[PDB]
Curated annotation (Swiss-Prot):
Pfam families: FeoC
Molecular function per GO: 4 iron, 4 sulfur cluster binding; DNA binding; iron ion binding
Family: Belongs to the FeoC family.
Keyword hit for Iron: yes
Free-text function comment from the UniProt entry: May function as a transcriptional regulator that controls feoABC expression.
Highest taxon of source: Bacteria
Name of the protein: Probable [Fe-S]-dependent transcriptional repressor FeoC
Statement: the UniProt record of this protein carries the keyword Transmembrane: no
Keywords noted in UniProt: DNA-binding, Iron, Iron-sulfur, Metal-binding, Repressor, Transcription, Transcription regulation
Induction: Up-regulated by S-nitrosoglutathione under anaerobic conditions. Repressed by the global regulator Fur.
Gene that specifies this protein: feoC
InterPro entries named among the record's database cross-references: FeoC, Tscrpt_reg_HTH_FeoC, WH-like_DNA-bd_sf, WH_DNA-bd_sf
Length: 78
């Protein structure tokens, strides 16, 4: 495995960015940085970031989804 300083440094260097990116930086497995991010989050080191919302068009009618996953939440430092 890699070091946390990597994700932390990258998080600082590359600022706010998804883990997918960080993981790539260290060619690490997706299901690796997320775990760390969770730990840091619990502690209160990094912060959660949100990406642009979603939208759609529609004439005269109403219909929403069923919750569905949330936007691609990004991660950053505090």
């Amino acid at each position: 495995m890699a070091s946390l300083i990597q994700v932390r440094d990258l998080l600082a260097l590359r600022g706010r960015m998804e883990a997918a990116q960080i993981s790539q930086t260290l060619n690490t497995p997706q299901p690796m940085i997320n775990a760390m991010l969770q730990q840091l989050e619990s502690m209160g080191k990094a912060v959660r970031i949100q990406e642009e919302p979603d939208g759609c068009l529609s004439g005269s009618c109403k219909s929403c989804p069923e919750g569905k996953a949330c936007l691609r939440e990004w991660w950053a430092l505090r």
